Every structure is written in structure tokens, then in C-alpha cells.
């Protein structure tokens, strides 16, 4: 049942006497029993990808062959916990080793077997009932926010022979007994699923509901949807991690899976410190955010091979909750670090590289990863509906959107949130380019917007036209010097600045811009566009008369309106609620209309 | 009838990525097929890429995960992947390997065809002539498509190339003075697009004549290497044996080219530009050229393949080699898309080789050729004027340059811009062409003979 | 008498097509006839050489082409000219060759364009901008050349 190590080249270990070993089986390499996964088979020798540092491994060390493939433990005890790249809980390691360093070769259960869970059966099943994969036969109250549905694993079915009555059970007990054809199966609360296999769904559905983001831009102009996939290929300093953290803190998703794959270690600590201090009212009661989130840490200075396991572990967790009828919005803050791991392993493997040193199969891995997102009808008799969204960062070198990872990613993701380093240098955050970005879900959400708002869509269109016209002018104004500009163009240029400085950028570390409820975004946009139309009309109706209302006349006459419009961001929705903000915005609209009547 | 029992081997030498290497094989046949039975009972198939002595390299279509080097059983079929084909494959949806996904039965083998293709004698090839009226002014006016042509649509990621291809499919027809069967090969297509086309075919009532081959982005990436060969093999049966006219759509030759690259790298072949196999040209030619008409038949195959262009360029090896093989392109641009123009087709880098012969008196309109050339030149000049204006300003242009700038703006707004649910005829397209040409005084329309101008221009 | 070979034919025949054509050309040259041989493309021939060079796993040169590409093109292009034929009749024939280099662009760094330019005496370059303006025939008139001026002056 053992092989022996033949050689080590770093993250790749070669082993012999493993004739019966299959690809993508787990092995235990070395006397510390390091976790690895078989990549290649050459006769009776196996090529092993090791997810822990291989320093100190000797030729001749035993290698245990484990029949089970790389898999994830799924059950109660995930939410609120932080995992490493292969689902070993860091709070359980630190509570047992008393160390500050993560030891190598740690064998810790993914989900604690000491906790006595509060379990209630569905009350609809009886002995002799026919149960199929995905069926829910009880609920565990992990906390007050997420009800953890106990599902029959996929590829399992049969008649119910015993169902645990309501009571206190841990993850080592038997909750459901079912039989198929003589063979009997005993299930606990925890199921195991290969991390590289896609969990099956009844039907993949179109995404027709916004994924609310606590941002003005990245929502009004470039919407994301529940179940959609987006990329943020920002250069360093562009603030893409902040966009990801903002979405995690303030969104309309039920579960957030945050994957820190190659991320700075300080970022994962920032989440663990800050999140417990955030609030989200449930039913009149204040509750912490961490009860509805989970996160995976595989930091930059951790084993590079683990970066692949981290990405797949995260999405596998996301699917698990998707199957229970929750809307999941996972975000992996790197992507490029995963592709980087693939390059480093491919090198050690001496594989023939493709574009810029990356493996030829880079596109294959990204395509199969992102396609696991989407709004679905779940398997299981209870007819659940869920989704997984993926918001993945990319780190192109130099900010040049030409690398195989950014290029391949853009061919996969349907929403493009491109960031511009030159906007970040000016602290124009979020640093969204708004010229190269796009969203292919605009048409999908047009029905939603008309149903609930109506006014939003024509405002979205006018805002895009103003920004595009400003760019079209800026190209030539740089060369002319603002000498040949018509009065109608000067208004466009200045309103476009108004939009850029006051609408598209916001300071996410303030009490007022940390979250921007949608009604506020469309409210303040309506006023800015209304100004555009009234100011443009004022000159169009007077340019040919005996006095033309040029910018300098409206600017001096309405200077208080332009300042008030810029102040509209400083509304603090937590201190001043919806009623005051709408009344305030209505007052600015009245002030503008009255000033125009006195002007024209 | 090959009534000879098949050999099954457990003599697996090793597995490396998508490749399984077998040894001790008796008289290996090149491009043979091997059925693999995994230790857990999973069945998969693969095709031999090379043989040498007692060794053979097998390309595994569904994937190699789970294969060991001790128990996996390898059954050699003794033949080349000849695929079952039937005239009643229309109204069916198959996966990337030609198996049912629509809850229907396995296609009944009316006959078998070698998917590698049987070369057609150029002496019997019939030159295409009849124009297809696609409804899209950018195509029917300038870069018209003949029946039997090979005109792929180039695009970059994010552009509406799926909408244009879908529009062509439901609006396809001939210039009149009865319809096409569709063979749709999806290679690396996401689920959102897959349902886009499937739903559009159903809503328009086309499914009676549509055969889908779906290899989705989440399906195996080796399988899609044969997917396009299975699609065209069916098209060839329907067009050349069942006297049907078949329009073949290939959703992305780029995901196909990537699949070839993955295999080429796996066998440590010497690459050419950007890591792709030096033989990419041949692998594409053997698919693209499965088109046209043949003497003695009434059917035809028209191909309109789609190619995503990495990095928005058109020198990437994939579109570069395709351009050398196919008879022009559409080339969907991005600058037109950002301006909310649909279809965002750029007429300058896009040509149709058969256009010069599929138009004119007896096929469309006497002046078709003259209108196309003049409009093209006018657009090209307008772009050069726009390039100057961006530097010298609108105050540094002469009267003639302004005429081309006015043409440029009205050309894209009135001619190119159409909408996805409106079709215009070749005669309506030319009438619009004339409306744009009549912006200029006749003296500036130097690519239209005086006789043509006097007949149409003053109307 | 033409030789027909399409892009979907085997790479070996794609390479040999040029040799077959010129063989027929020399055959009639030796009859005292004036032969004019038109090539469709020499970039497709060079492409065949690149494909085979790769398959044979021999060391490539620029852009994946074999380092001996220039030798193959020179061998073809130098099989031409006005000659005095072998045989008692003292007859004199000729072969003209008109090559055809498909332009990935106007950059003559293209290995095939560059190797051709070093051999051919007359180069009729086709300008992209004149083609865009539908000025036909599209000839640059600035980058083209013909080295037979003094020969024809007589």
C-alpha cells in the first residue's frame, strides 16, 4: 500500500513502486505525511504534485497511496471558519498546536467532530420513503443567518430505513440510513465530494437579477448579476482588492466565499479583524457578518502548489451552498497567482510551454472553473433555486492587458471591470476605466430595471453618452487648447467632470461611501443628468438670440447648484435614511429648476 | 465486415496529460480508436496519434483523470473513427462526440463516413455563383456571400458575434428576381451562448432542419478536436448524398486551435508562432475546405466559421492562418461596438473573394459592383480624414474632406446600423448605398462609370 | 497546362507542386518555345516547408521557417532565363517565372518576402493604401524595382 520517493525537484516529487496508482489520487509523501496529488504516470513511477514544502524529503521516503481523490468535506461547521488551501481549519490548528507557524504534515479534520449540532428532520420522510440525490432530510442551525440543509449526496439513492429524530448530534453520528439494492449506506452530516468534479444541477438558468455592489460605478454603468462571472484585471495599487472586499461586506448575496490565493497575509487578517465588527440586521436584530461568510487563506508565501487546490476548494464550497438554495457570490482575489502556480509546476514537469511560458491548457482550466458559476435549478425534490457568482481578480504584469491570463479570462467572463492605474494614482477610486469596461448583462436586467425603477435605464444611457463625448473631445482639446470648443461642448466637458469626480469615485473607507444603496445612486444620477439637459437646453435656445447663455454665465449664476450637486455624496445613509436623502435630492432638483427659470 | 475479435490490453505504459501511452500492442493501426475502461467502470474513448513498434500514443477525448497504469483496459476497434450518419439527424441535439444529449436514441447508422474527409476532385468542383441574401447591409451590399463560400466571422471577446451569426442563420436566403439546413458545431461555448442559439432556433421554428453538436466550455477540451469533423461529416452526407443545402456554423475555431495546441505540446512537437503546432495550417485547411458544390449534385455546403481573436489583433496565428485559407471574412470590430453600432462590422479589413462574380446583371443589379467599390473608397477616405481631424482639428479641413466626414458619420448611422430583427434586401441595401453616394457631387465619384451615374445617381 | 493543388491537399504534394510545375516548364523550354510560368503563391510553398521542418524536428530559423528556405527559393527562381537549348537544331527557348508572395504586411522582414527580394530581378509590390482606394492595378511605384532596364535599353 506504499510506494517510495525516487526524486524531488521542488513542488514536484517523483515516486516509484506505484504501479496501481491512478491520476488525481491523494498521496502521503514522507514521514511527516505531506499531502500531494498524482499528476503523471510513467510505468510504475508516479509524478506527484505536493501541496506542502518538500524541504527535508529524502529519496526512499514512503509514499502512501490513498484511493480517494482530492476532495472537500461538506457539512456544518464551515461558516465563520477560515481554511487553508486544502481545507485544514486555521483556528483548529492554532488551538491545538499552540504555535504561530503552520506545521507541515498536519492531519486535522476539516469539520470538528466535537460540536453537538441542533438537528431537526424534515418531518416529511418515513421509513420506506424513496429519497434521491440532493433531497433535504433535515436542517442544522449553524447560526441565526444561514440554515444548513442536510442533503443526500449526489450519486446516492434508495429507500429510507432510519431517520434520526430531532435532537443534538455531532458529525460522527448517523443521521440517515438508506438502502438501495441490499447494500446499506450510513450517512452523517458530512459528505465528501471530489474537488475537481462539478456538482450536478437540474438546469442552468439565465441570470435575471442584479448582484448588488456597494459602488456607484460597477453597478449603474456595468452591472453584475447573480450567477454571473466578472474579472477585475487591475494593476497593483488599482484597488481591486478593495472592490472585492466592498462587494463582500455590502451585497445582497446570502453566502460569500472569499479565496485569498497568493494574496498578502495582512489582507486575510484585515478580514478577520474587521468583519466581526460589521452589522447586518436580519429581522430587527443586529447580527455580525461572519456568520454568513467563509474564507480560504493560501497566502503568497505558502506552498505554490496549494494555489490550485485553494481555487478549486473555494468554488466547491460555493457549489455546496448553491445546492441548498442560497445565492453564493465567491471571489478569488488573484487568478494570476493560480495560473502562476500552473506555470511553475509545468516548468518543473519539463512540459512544452505555450504563450509566455504558460501551459497550453491554461484556457482549459479557466473555462471549466468559471462555467461552474451560474443561477441554477438545484437537484433535490424540494425544488431549491441558487446561484454562484464569481468575481475574480487578475494581476497582469505592468498593467498590460495582454498576458495569457487576462486574455483568456476576458474570453470567458461576461462582465469586464477594467481598472486604470492612472486613475488610481490620482486616488480616483474605484479606479474604473469606464471606457474599456463592459457588461453583457445589460439586456438581461433591462426587464428588472423597468419593473422597479424605469427612470434608471435612460439615465444610464445618457451618462454613457456624456462620458464618451468627453473622451472624444479630450483627444482633440489636448491639441487645440480649448479654443474651438462650442458652448454646447464646454457644458458637456464640465458636466462630464461633474460626473467623474462626484459620481464615479467614492471613498470606501468613510461612513457615507462605504455603501451606496442603489436608490441613492440613481437618485443623484437623475439630478446630474437633469442638470445636463437643462444646461444644454439653456444654451441651445439662446445661442442664436440677442444674448447667449455661455458656460461663464450659468457657472456664475448657478455656482451654489454645482457645489450642492458635488455635496450629494455626503449623505451618510446610516445616519440619514431614505426619506431624508430623497427629500434632499428633490430639493436640489427644485433649486435647479427655479434658478433656470430666473436665468433664461 | 471486420468479423475479427478485438484485442483488449492492460499493457499501459503511462499517462501524460491528455495522452495515454500503450505498449505491447499487436500491429497498431494509425488513427485507430481505443475504448478505455477505467478501474471504476467509466468508459471513455480516444484516437491514436502515432504508432511506433509495439507502442502507441492515444489521444483521450473525454479526459484522462482517473486512469491508472495497471488495470485500465484498452480495446482497439481495428478501424478508423467512421461515424454513423443519418438523414434524420436533423431535429436532434448531440454532444461534442456525436452522442445524444436530447433524451433521444443513439443515431441509427444509415451509413458510416470517415470523419477525416474524402478529398473532392477539383475537376468536378462547381464554382459557386448564387448570392445568399443575408439581410445585413454590411454583407449583402459590400462583402456579399455566395452559396458554397467560406467566409468566417472574426471577432474579439465581448463583441456580438453570436448575435450576427444567429441573425444570418434565421434570415438566410437567396436573392429573388427553398431554405438551409443548419449544422451547428459548438466548440468551447458557454452555457449562456448555448441556450441563446438553441432558443433562437426554437422560437423561429427552425429546429425541424437543425442538427446541433454541443461541446460546451465545461466539457472536455480534447473531444472538441473531432467535434468540427463530426459536424462537417454530417453536412457532407446531407449536402452531397441527400441533396440538401446546408449552412455550417463553427462557434469558435480558436478553442479548437487551443485544443490542438494542448495536444501538440503534450507530444513535445516543435511549435511555430505563439506555441501552436507547425501544422496548424493543414489542420484548418482540412476543415475549412469541406464546402462548395460538386458536379451532379444539387445540394451545397456554405461555411461561416467564427474565430475569437486574442488581444483584438488580426495577426495572431489563428486568424492569420485562417485568412490564408478562407475566402475573406466579416471582421467584427470593437470601435463600432463601443459606439453602440450593430452590426459593428468594419468594412475596410474585410473582403469577400467571390463577391466580384456573385453580383451584377442577372444576379442582383447592374450597378452592384460599382456602388460597392465607391462606398468602400468613400469610407476608407473618411477614416483617413478622421485620422487627420484628430490632429489638425475640424477647423483645418477643406470642403471635400468635410463631405467624406459627413459621409462617414451618415454611412455608419444609416447604412451599417441595422438592428438584429430587421432584414433588408440587396436592392434595398443598394438604394441606401445610393442615398449615401448622393452626398457627393458626381465629379467626386471616380469609381463609378459615367453611364452608371446617369442611370441611378439623379433618381 | 495548369497544375491544381488546394490548401486541403497533403503538405508533401503542396511542396512538390512547384517542382512539378517548373519541371513541365523546362520540358517545353527545351523545345524552343517561350514559356511563362505563373505561381499562385510561394508563401504557401514556404508554409509547407515550415510544416515539414517542424514535423521532422529539425532546428528552425526565423519565424519557424527552415534556415534553408532561401536555398529552396533560389533553386526554384534560378531555374529560368533565355537559354540555348541542347540538341542539334540549335533552337533557343526561355522560361519566365512570376512568383507571388502573399503579404502578412508591408514589412519586408517577412522571411519569404526578404528571401524572394534577394533573388528576383523584378518586384511589382502592391500598395495597401492604393488597394483601399480601389485604384487598380494597385502598384506602389516607389518601392518596386526592375533590374532589366539596361538589358531592354537596346
Amino acid at each position: 500500500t506504499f510506494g517510495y520517493v525516487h526524486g524531488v525537484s521542488g513542488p514536484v516529487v517523483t515516486a516509484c513502486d506505484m504501479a496501481g496508482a491512478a491520476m488525481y489520487e491523494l498521496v502521503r509523501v514522507g514521514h511527516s505525511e505531506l499531502v500531494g496529488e498524482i499528476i503523471r504516470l510513467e510505468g510504475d513511477m508516479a509524478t506527484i504534485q505536493v501541496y506542502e514544502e518538500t524541504s527535508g524529503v529524502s529519496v526512499g521516503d514512503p509514499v502512501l497511496r490513498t484511493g480517494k481523490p482530492l476532495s472537500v468535506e461538506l457539512g456544518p461547521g464551515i461558516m465563520g471558519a477560515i481554511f487553508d488551501g486544502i481545507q485544514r481549519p486555521l483556528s483548529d490548528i492554532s488551538s491545538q498546536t499552540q504555535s504561530i507557524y503552520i506545521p507541515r504534515g498536519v492531519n486535522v479534520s476539516a469539520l470538528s467532530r466535537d460540536i453537538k449540532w441542533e438537528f431537526i428532520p424534515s418531518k416529511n420522510l418515513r421509513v420506506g420513503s424513496h429519497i434521491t440525490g440532493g433531497d433535504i432530510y433535515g436542517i442544522v442551525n449553524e447560526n441565526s443567518l444561514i440554515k444548513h440543509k442536510i442533503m443526500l449526496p449526489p450519486r446516492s439513492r434508495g429507500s429510507v430505513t432510519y431517520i434520526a429524530p430531532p435532537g443534538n448530534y455531532d458529525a460522527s453520528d448517523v443521521v440517515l440510513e438508506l438502502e438501495f439494492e441490499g447494500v446499506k449506506e450510513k450517512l452523517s452530516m458530512v459528505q465528501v465530494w471530489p474537488v475537481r468534479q462539478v456538482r450536478p444541477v437540474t438546469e442552468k438558468l439565465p441570470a435575471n437579477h442584479p448582484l448588488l455592489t456597494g459602488q456607484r460605478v460597477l453597478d449603474a454603468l456595468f452591472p453584475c448579476v447573480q450567477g454571473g462571472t466578472t474579472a477585475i484585471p487591475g494593476a497593483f495599487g488599482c484597488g481591486k482588492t478593495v472592490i472585492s472586499q466592498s462587494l463582500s461586506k455590502y451585497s445582497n448575496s446570502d453566502v460569500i466565499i472569499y479565496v485569498g490565493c497568493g494574496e498578502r497575509g495582512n489582507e486575510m487578517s484585515e478580514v478577520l479583524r474587521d468583519f466581526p465588527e460589521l452589522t447586518m440586521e436580519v429581522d430587527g436584530k443586529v447580527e455580525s457578518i461572519m456568520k454568513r461568510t467563509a474564507l480560504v487563506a493560501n497566502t503568497s508565501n505558502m506552498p505554490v502548489a496549494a494555489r490550485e487546490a485553494s481555487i478549486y476548494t473555494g468554488i466547491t464550497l460555493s457549489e455546496y451552498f448553491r445546492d441548498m438554495g442560497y445565492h453564493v457570490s465567491m471571489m478569488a482575489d488573484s487568478t494570476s497567482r493560480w495560473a502562476e502556480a500552473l506555470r511553475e509546476i509545468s516548468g518543473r514537469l519539463a512540459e512544452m510551454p505555450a504563450d509566455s511560458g504558460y501551459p497550453a491548457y491554461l484556457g482549459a482550466r479557466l473555462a471549466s472553473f468559471y462555467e461552474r458559476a451560474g443561477r441554477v435549478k438545484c437537484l433535490g425534490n424540494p425544488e431549491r433555486e441558487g446561484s454562484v457568482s464569481i468575481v475574480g481578480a487578475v494581476s497582469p504584469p505592468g498593467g498590460d492587458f495582454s498576458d495569457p491570463v487576462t486574455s483568456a479570462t476576458l474570453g470567458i467572463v461576461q462582465v469586464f471591470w477594467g481598472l486604470d492605474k492612472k486613475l488610481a494614482q490620482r486616488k480616483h477610486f474605484p479606479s474604473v476605466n469606464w471606457l474599456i469596461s463592459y457588461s453583457k448583462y445589460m439586456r438581461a436586467l433591462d426587464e428588472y430595471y423597468d419593473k422597479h425603477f424605469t427612470e434608471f435605464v435612460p439615465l444610464r444611457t445618457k451618462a454613457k453618452e456624456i462620458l464618451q463625448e468627453e473622451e472624444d473631445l479630450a483627444e482633440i482639446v489636448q491639441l487645440v487648447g480649448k479654443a474651438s470648443l462650442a458652448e454646447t461642448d464646454k457644458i458637456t466637458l464640465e458636466v462630464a467632470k461633474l460626473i467623474k469626480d462626484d459620481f464615479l469615485q467614492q471613498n470606501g473607507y468613510t461612513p457615507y461611501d462605504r455603501f451606496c444603496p442603489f436608490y441613492k445612486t440613481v437618485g443623484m444620477l437623475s439630478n446630474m443628468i437633469s442638470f445636463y439637459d437643462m444646461a444644454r437646453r439653456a444654451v441651445e435656445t439662446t445661442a442664436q438670440s440677442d444674448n447667449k447663455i455661455t458656460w461663464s454665465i450659468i457657472r456664475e449664476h448657478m455656482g451654489e447648484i454645482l457645489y450642492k450637486l458635488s455635496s450629494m455624496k455626503f449623505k451618510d445613509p446610516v445616519k440619514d435614511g431614505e426619506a431624508k436623502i430623497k427629500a434632499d435630492y428633490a430639493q436640489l432638483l427644485e433649486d435647479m429648476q427655479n434658478a433656470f427659470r430666473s436665468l433664461e | 465486415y471486420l468479423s475479427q475479435p478485438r484485442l483488449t490490453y492492460k499493457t499501459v505504459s503511462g499517462v501524460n496529460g491528455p495522452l495515454v501511452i500503450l505498449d505491447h500492442v499487436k500491429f497498431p493501426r494509425y488513427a485507430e480508436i481505443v475504448h478505455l475502461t477505467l478501474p471504476d467502470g467509466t468508459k471513455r474513448s480516444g484516437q491514436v496519434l502515432e504508432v511506433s513498434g509495439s507502442k502507441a500514443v492515444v489521444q483521450v477525448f473525454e479526459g484522462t483523470s482517473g486512469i491508472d497504469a495497471k488495470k485500465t483496459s484498452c480495446e482497439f476497434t481495428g478501424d478508423i473513427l467512421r461515424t454513423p450518419v443519418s438523414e434524420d439527424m436533423l431535429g436532434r441535439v448531440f454532444n461534442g462526440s456525436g452522442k445524444p444529449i436530447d433524451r433521444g436514441p443513439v443515431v441509427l447508422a444509415e451509413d458510416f463516413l470517415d470523419i477525416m474527409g474524402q478529398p473532392i476532385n477539383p475537376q468536378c468542383r462547381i464554382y459557386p455563383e448564387e448570392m445568399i441574401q443575408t439581410g445585413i447591409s454590411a454583407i449583402d451590399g459590400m462583402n456579399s456571400i455566395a452559396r458554397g463560400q467560406k467566409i468566417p466571422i472574426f471577432s474579439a471577446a465581448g463583441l456580438p458575434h453570436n448575435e450576427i451569426a444567429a441573425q444570418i442563420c434565421r434570415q438566410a436566403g437567396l436573392v429573388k428576381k427553398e431554405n438551409f439546413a443548419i449544422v451547428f458545431a459548438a466548440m468551447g461555448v458557454n452555457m449562456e451562448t448555448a441556450r441563446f442559439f438553441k432558443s433562437d432556433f426554437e422560437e423561429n421554428g427552425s429546429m425541424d432542419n437543425v442538427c446541433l453538436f454541443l461541446n460546451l466550455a465545461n466539457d472536455p477540451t480534447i473531444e472538441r478536436i473531432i467535434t468540427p469533423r463530426l459536424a462537417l461529416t454530417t453536412a457532407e452526407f446531407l449536402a452531397y448524398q441527400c441533396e440538401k443545402h446546408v449552412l455550417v456554423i463553427l462557434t469558435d475555431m480558436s478553442s479548437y486551435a487551443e485544443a490542438l495546441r494542448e495536444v501538440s505540446a503534450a507530444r513535445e512537437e516543435v511549435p511555430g508562432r505563439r506555441g501552436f503546432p507547425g501544422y496548424m495550417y493543414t489542420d484548418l485547411a482540412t476543415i475549412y475546405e469541406r464546402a462548395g458544390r460538386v458536379e451532379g449534385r444539387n445540394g451545397s455546403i456554405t461555411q461561416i466559421p467564427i474565430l475569437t481573436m486574442p488581444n483584438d489583433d488580426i495577426t495572431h496565428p489563428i486568424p492569420d492562418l485562417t485568412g490564408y485559407i478562407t475566402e475573406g471574412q466579416i471582421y467584427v470590430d470593437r470601435q463600432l461596438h463601443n459606439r453602440q453600432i450593430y452590426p459593428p462590422i468594419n468594412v475596410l479589413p474585410s473582403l469577400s473573394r467571390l463577391m466580384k462574380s456573385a453580383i451584377g446583371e442577372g444576379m442582383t443589379r447592374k450597378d452592384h459592383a460599382d456602388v460597392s467599390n465607391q462606398l468602400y473608397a468613400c469610407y476608407a477616405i473618411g477614416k483617413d480624414v478622421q485620422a487627420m481631424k484628430a490632429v489638425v482639428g475640424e477647423e483645418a479641413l477643406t470642403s471635400d474632406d468635410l463631405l467624406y466626414l459627413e459621409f462617414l458619420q451618415k454611412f455608419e448611422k444609416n447604412f451599417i446600423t441595422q438592428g438584429p430583427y430587421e432584414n433588408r434586401t440587396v436592392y434595398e441595401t443598394l438604394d441606401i448605398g445610393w442615398q449615401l453616394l448622393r452626398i457627393f457631387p458626381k465629379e467626386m465619384l471616380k469609381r463609378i462609370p459615367q453611364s452608371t451615374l446617369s442611370e441611378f445617381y439623379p433618381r | 497546362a495548369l497544375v491544381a493543388n488546394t490548401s486541403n491537399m497533403p503538405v508533401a504534394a503542396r511542396e512538390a507542386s512547384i517542382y512539378t510545375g517548373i519541371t513541365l516548364s523546362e520540358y517545353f523550354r527545351d523545345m524552343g518555345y517561350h514559356v511563362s510560368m505563373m505561381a499562385d503563391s510561394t508563401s504557401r510553398w514556404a508554409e509547407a516547408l515550415r510544416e515539414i521542418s517542424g514535423r521532422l524536428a529539425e532546428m528552425p530559423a526565423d519565424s519557424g521557417y527552415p534556415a534553408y528556405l532561401g536555398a529552396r527559393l533560389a533553386s526554384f527562381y534560378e531555374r529560368a532565363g533565355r537559354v540555348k537549348c541542347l540538341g542539334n537544331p540549335e533552337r533557343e527557348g526561355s522560361v519566365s517565372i512570376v512568383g507571388a508572395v502573399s503579404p502578412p504586411g508591408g514589412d519586408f522582414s517577412d522571411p519569404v518576402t526578404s528571401a524572394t527580394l534577394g533573388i528576383v530581378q523584378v518586384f511589382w509590390g502592391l500598395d495597401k493604401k492604393l488597394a483601399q482606394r480601389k485604384h487598380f492595378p494597385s502598384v506602389n511605384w516607389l518601392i518596386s524595382y526592375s533590374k532589366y532596364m539596361r538589358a531592354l535599353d537596346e
Binding site: 512544452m352 510551454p353 | - | 524536428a57
Partner: peptide, 19 residues
């Protein structure tokens, strides 16, 4: 260059195995 170097090394390795 990188790919060509590895190709030359792989060819050398293949040749040694054949001897």
C-alpha cells in the same frame, strides 16, 4: 529561444536512451 533549447535537450535525451 527557451522552447528551442528544451527541444534540443529533449532530442539529446531521446538519443541517449536509444543507445
Amino acid at each position: 529561444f527557451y522552447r528551442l533549447k528544451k527541444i534540443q535537450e529533449k532530442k539529446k535525451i531521446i538519443k541517449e536512451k536509444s543507445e
